[PDB]
Swiss-Prot record:
This is CRISPR system Cascade subunit CasA. Belongs to the CRISPR associated protein CasA/Cse1 family. Type I-E/Ecoli subfamily. Disruption phenotype: Loss of resistance to bacteriophage lambda infection, loss of plasmid silencing. CRISPR (clustered regularly interspaced short palindromic repeat), is an adaptive immune system that provides protection against mobile genetic elements (viruses, transposable elements and conjugative plasmids). CRISPR clusters contain sequences complementary to antecedent mobile elements and target invading nucleic acids. CRISPR clusters are transcribed and processed into CRISPR RNA (crRNA). Part of the Cascade ribonucleoprotein complex, with stoichiometry CasA(1),CasB(2),CasC(6),CasD(1),CasE(1)-crRNA(1). Interacts directly with the 5' end of crRNA, CasB, CasD and CasE. Binding of target ssRNA or dsDNA causes a conformational change in the Cascade complex; CasA is required for high affinity target DNA binding. Interacts with Cas3 once Cascade has recognized target DNA. It comes from Escherichia coli (strain K12). Induction: Repressed by H-NS, activated by LeuO. Activated by the BaeSR two-component regulatory system, possibly due to envelope stress. Part of the casABCDE-ygbT-ygbF operon.
Amino acid sequence: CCGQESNLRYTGFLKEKFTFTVNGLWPHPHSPCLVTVKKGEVEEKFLAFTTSAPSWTQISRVVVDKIIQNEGNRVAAVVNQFRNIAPQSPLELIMGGYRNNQASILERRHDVLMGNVINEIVTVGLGYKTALRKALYTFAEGFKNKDFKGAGVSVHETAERHFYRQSELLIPDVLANVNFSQADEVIADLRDKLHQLCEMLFNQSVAPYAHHPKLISTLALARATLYKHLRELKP
DNA sequence: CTGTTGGCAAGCCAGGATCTGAACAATACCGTCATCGAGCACTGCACAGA
Ligand SMILES: [Zn+2]
């Protein structure tokens, strides 16, 4: 596994089925959580990479940090402590998680290494991500309400995954050219790029349902939603 | 063998209205996680004794 020499090396183990039930939610201090209020009670759910694993090369920790900071998400208890001990000190994460289909691991995202522009870049990135999601969720819902079947009800999931992968290609050049005087220019260029990408991904996600006349109002509403949110992103 | 030149080519005025443009029914399903032990199959294994 590691390639190092070792006196003792294990080669197998034994396991057996074993079940129980933990009622309630144990206050684990190492994970951020989502706060939801159902009925009058407060519900918490620990964060997990569900249908996407938000990540960019070099700055994945910043992407995850901002999602917790902005999108009912709450920071981990160990992070909450550090903020209270040093409120003015800059805070970066060491983070990781898996995307899974039951026993199968589909995706791994980990940032393990031991600035405001980067925050701005990530903030901009997430904005276009959100614009795309709202547009395609609008399509997916309309697709569902129109009694249509198939993968049309989750096109917002695939397109979100494709968003991060297609935009990751832009990141190295962006990071390489960032400095005091060039920051506003490279971020503006990033916006145009991400604007174009969102349009492409929208069209790509929706392409298999061309010539479905009953879906034209759903498609039209979805694209109008996209451009509404894209316009709100240009400063 | 030898075949030409000048001068000249128009203007007026006029192009429409009525009224009409559809409806129904139908858009799929499967598989591409895993676990455990059991109940029940190919499948060769020599043989012992036929
Ligand atoms: Zn090792």
